[PDB]
Amino acid sequence: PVLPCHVGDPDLWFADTPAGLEVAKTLCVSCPIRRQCLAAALQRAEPWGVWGGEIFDQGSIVSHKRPRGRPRK
């Protein structure tokens, strides 16, 4: 099988900006494996990265990664 993650540079899926993670997350939408990827990553409680089209943070899904500074109100 050919996967969208395996083309490019993989650190995109572990990108530090919320932007890079959103990019990788939309790249995952084309993956023939996606729901697998997600299930297995949840079942290993991955600490970070984008798996099956979702951002992970300490074993759960975070939807959006917080930016670096103080939050806008």
Added chain:
Amino acid sequence: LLQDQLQSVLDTLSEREAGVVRLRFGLTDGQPRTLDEIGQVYGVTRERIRQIESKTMSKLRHPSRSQVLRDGTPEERLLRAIFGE
């Protein structure tokens, strides 16, 4: 054989990430290292090395790096620690 291609994916990490896993699994000289020793080489504490190693293992599990490589020596143990038991 095979030992080479993982040395490829190792080379997709930063030097500290790669070296931390190399030392942990004794890939270059057969001897696994303790977290403390590893910290001594990179000038940081053992706990920092543990955090680095956790995240790097997460990266190695990731299909972007691990999918091409699904096919008691230290490389055996590394592949084992990547996947299940």
Added chain:
DNA sequence: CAGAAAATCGGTTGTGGT
């Protein structure tokens, strides 16, 4: 404008468990 506040980051400390 000038702080103050809130958050992440890379890292250490403290506690405790085999």
Added chain:
DNA sequence: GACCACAACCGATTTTCT
């Protein structure tokens, strides 16, 4: 004592709010 997992904490920096 050796080894390490977990959480709390720390100084720097970054961003935004008053």
